Design a protein around this nucleic acid. Structure first.
Lengths: 181, 172
DNA sequence: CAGCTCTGTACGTGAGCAGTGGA
DNA sequence: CCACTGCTCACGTACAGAGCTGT
């Protein structure tokens, strides 16, 4: 229902659990609010102006940020996705990453990665911490970074100011690598 | 898109504006469980056990309650709507009411009615209060009852029940 | 006991909204 | 004509409360 906005040689690709009802209707990646995503991006410095879901297709290629989503179907969401739903979901994800070889995969939401590690790596992870996870996407030099959901539904991060921090860190990792070159 | 759920011999027909995302996605009417509507229904004796949104196809059955909305095009908000879609919205609605002929049309907001008026009867209705309104549906004996939103009262539900009981009662 | 799959909740913020009562 | 209370929602995620566990 909600397409991918991937190109080759992306620095960052943002992975979302699934598209919300609002995103399904609206057709563009991260509308809301509550979605910090757009605000955080501008706040973090990842974009120098504030933009919004209407600009989602400009992001690879102005910014080299592509969107995609672990599960393409729309739910409310998110509590309603089966446990098997993601499993067949993430598999497709890997293949995408493999093809596209972005520098960094950014997992918007710990629930995503928590199942991802379990099923793609085969590791139940202890007490996950946001930020960089050790591993690479298997046939590629693409690094996984985990970040709390943009969705305002998670309580522990009340505001865009609360999650901006990860976005700043992500930018750092980006121009670390880009820089070494 | 969301169905109408209407039967010929209905007492109450419940009329929203457009369906919303949740309603359209679930395929059923007033789905919550943060919608008061099902609670209100049960509390005020209209149902006698607490139903839930999926049970909306059985309400014309034993309860005589049908659902509709003024504009069937789905949308998050009202704000998303040209008046033109309402204008066309209104005519269509009226037709079905004329056709199905329920005792009472119940307006799910003051808002819907507020514009139903100027579309249909071409007036503004000054310092509107809830409850039974004076006019009937054009060319019909169907009444208009406006009660407050389900989204926020239980009293008016009971009133509506009673009014229904009166209407039933006169004919008998 | 910590250690650990289960469910299973009760979490803060803001846009949005229905209704009311004001510059 | 717009400023009010209070109320669901939103691409979740953190912690008590069960029923199991080992040198």
């Amino acid at each position: 229902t909600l397409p991918d906005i991937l190109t080759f040689n992306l620095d960052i690709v943002i992975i979302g659990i699934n598209p919300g009802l609002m995103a399904a209707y609206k057709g563009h990646h991260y509308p809301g609010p509550g979605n910090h995503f757009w605000k955080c991006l501008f706040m973090s410095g990842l974009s120098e102006v504030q933009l919004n879901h209407m600009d989602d297709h400009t992001l690879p290629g102005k910014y080299g940020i592509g969107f995609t989503n672990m599960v393409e179907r729309t739910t409310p969401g998110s509590k309603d996705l089966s446990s098997k739903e993601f499993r067949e979901g993430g598999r497709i994800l890997v293949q995408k990453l493999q093809k596209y070889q972005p520098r960094i995969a950014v997992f918007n939401g710990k629930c995503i990665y928590e199942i991802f590690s379990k099923e793609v790596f085969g590791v139940k992870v202890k007490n996950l911490e946001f930020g960089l996870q050790p591993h690479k996407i298997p046939d590629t030099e693409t690094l996984c970074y985990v970040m709390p959901s943009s969705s305002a539904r998670c309580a522990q991060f009340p505001r865009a100011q609360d999650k901006v921090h990860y976005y700043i860190k992500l930018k750092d990792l980006r121009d670390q690598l880009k820089g070494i070159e």
